[PDB]
Symmetry: C2
Subunit: 225 residues, 2 copies
């Protein structure tokens, strides 16, 4: 609903940046996600990354809660790449997709921290409906360490007035899922974690102390039984 | 989010730095005039979420009797270093209404200063916190509450885009890493008004960094505040 707003304002604005620059986890995906299966990009947004995943996967469906995102994404449609609206909370939509495309792998980039922790049960049921017993999910999320990285950065290049560092902290509300809490979310719902590492994305922009801001991510790959 | 962990790390260093080290008054508590004008002058002051005790040392040089309280034992262990006659530091969880009542019986009816405390806790604990506030203030007492605006996330986003840009592809991913504050000026007003508070004084304050970004721009920490009385 607020994500519908965000994609209307972003789309007021083929070729590909570099290699594994877009998807540095790609080798992990090909290693753990059967390529013979179709791939759903849950929370595909404007389809940029979905397009780049398609270079490697022959049957790809991006889906997203926002109709703006899908409409913009739909621009990139081709044979073997397709886009559709789907709320990860709407298990009956997930069922309808599963029965269309078949058992499928599912890649999420940023989706769990994109929604209320109360919608996670439904989202994970959706993932389970899409995967059946042959499909696997690749899920990557920005860690609570991101807020620690913004706190540090405000700390030295935009310090709050004196004695106001902890009030600044109060406004820096972290994400819920680190490495262990991502693994607990999948395991407590009946998933087998096949793989699970961390991953950092540096900024090409040089901060005054010759440091580079680091965006901290964490991913796992999971399957049912 | 984990306030004992924060304060043990910050308190791991420091001999507490008197307030005159960091500023010459005005900059620590720009809002003090709004407090002198609308709070009752005779009542003791509670600093809810007092932390290491810096701002409460400052306030206790304008207010005869002041008690700073915080969830975090570490925070209070450090704050107690600043202790002197008329300046007092205790462990109080704003949730724990029983503890809030025990203070009210000891201290008497009080004014309460809150900095950041409502966004420092879970919206689920807000009804309990407002009850703690009603218990300390009684009839005569009032609250000054100041909170970092929801548009802080927007300021951080602007900063990051300009000097710490995300990897190409990661812009939307990084917007989700921004868990937004929920009390803007209209929302902080409602929370107090829908729980039987009268709002005497409500405005917005912008507290600026002295550090100059490479842009030439200065970082603007967006605040909002109000003074509330039990109706
Ligand atoms: N319940 C839900 N179901 C599906 N998508 C959702 C959702 N809640 C949020 N989203 C989507 O999740 C995305 C989060 S950020 C965009 C992620 C995208 N794969 C990328 O890296 O570019 C947004 O597109 C948002 O619209
Ligand atoms: N439930 C709760 N009850 C009491 N204090 C709390 C609390 N949750 C958070 N706090 C405290 O509220 C503060 C929020 S930020 C710190 C503001 C403080 N006046 C200062 O300038 O340092 C922290 O000190 C934190 O320890």
């Amino acid at each position: 609903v607020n994500w519908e707003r965000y994609w209307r304002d972003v789309t007021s604005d083929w070729h590909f940046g570099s290699g594994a620059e877009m998807a540095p986890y790609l080798p992990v995906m090909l290693d753990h996600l059967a390529p013979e299966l179709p791939l759903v990009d849950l929370g595909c947004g404007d389809g940029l990354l979905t397009d780049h995943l398609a270079r490697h996967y022959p049957v790809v469906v991006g889906v997203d809660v926002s109709p703006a995102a899908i409409a913009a994404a739909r621009g990139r449609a081709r044979p073997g790449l397709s886009f559709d609206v789907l709320d990860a909370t709407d298990v009956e939509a997930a069922a309808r997709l599963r029965a269309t495309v078949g058992e499928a792998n599912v890649h999420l980039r940023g989706v769990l921290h994109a929604m209320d922790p109360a919608d996670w049960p439904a989202a994970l049921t959706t993932l389970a409906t899409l995967t059946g017993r042959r499909g696997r999910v690749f899920d990557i999320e920005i860690t609570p360490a991101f807020s620690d990285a913004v706190e540090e950065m405000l700390g030295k290049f935009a310090a709050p007035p004196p004695g106001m560092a902890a009030v600044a902290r109060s406004g820096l509300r972290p994400t819920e899922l680190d490495s262990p809490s991502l693994r607990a979310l999948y395991e407590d719902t009946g998933w087998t974690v096949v793989a699970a590492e961390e991953l950092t994305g540096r900024s090409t922009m040089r901060l005054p102390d010759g440091s580079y801001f680091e965006y901290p991510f964490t991913y796992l790959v999971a399957g049912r039984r």
